[PDB]
């Protein structure tokens, strides 16, 4: 139950192919 | 780019077949209103002559 340092608490803490397949064709 | 262009050029045609299907509706929907103005005007064909 000893408090810890504050600077240690602050220390521990498929949509791609759907266009390519349509850009290769047209 | 040509692979775009003709691919676009058919899509424009897809709206032309749209657009006349709107236009041939207005040529319908005007006429009844024009009919709704003949049936009033043939009233006056009597009344003025009265």
From Swiss-Prot, chain B:
Entry superkingdom: Eukaryota
Subcellular location: Nucleus
Secretion signal span: none
Subunit annotation: Dimerizes via the C-terminal coiled coil. Interacts directly with HTL1, NPL6, RSC6 and the N-terminus of STH1. Component of the two forms of the RSC complex composed of at least either RSC1 or RSC2, and ARP7, ARP9, LDB7, NPL6, RSC3, RSC30, RSC4, RSC58, RSC6, RSC8, RSC9, SFH1, STH1, HTL1 and probably RTT102. The complexes interact with histone and histone variant components of centromeric chromatin.
Task of the protein: Component of the chromatin structure-remodeling complex (RSC), which is involved in transcription regulation and nucleosome positioning. RSC is responsible for the transfer of a histone octamer from a nucleosome core particle to naked DNA. The reaction requires ATP and involves an activated RSC-nucleosome intermediate. Remodeling reaction also involves DNA translocation, DNA twist and conformational change.
Note: Present with 3380 molecules/cell in log phase SD medium.
Name of protein: Chromatin structure-remodeling complex protein RSC8
Annotated source species: Saccharomyces cerevisiae (strain ATCC 204508 / S288c) (Baker's yeast)
Full-protein positions shown: 407 to 456 of 557
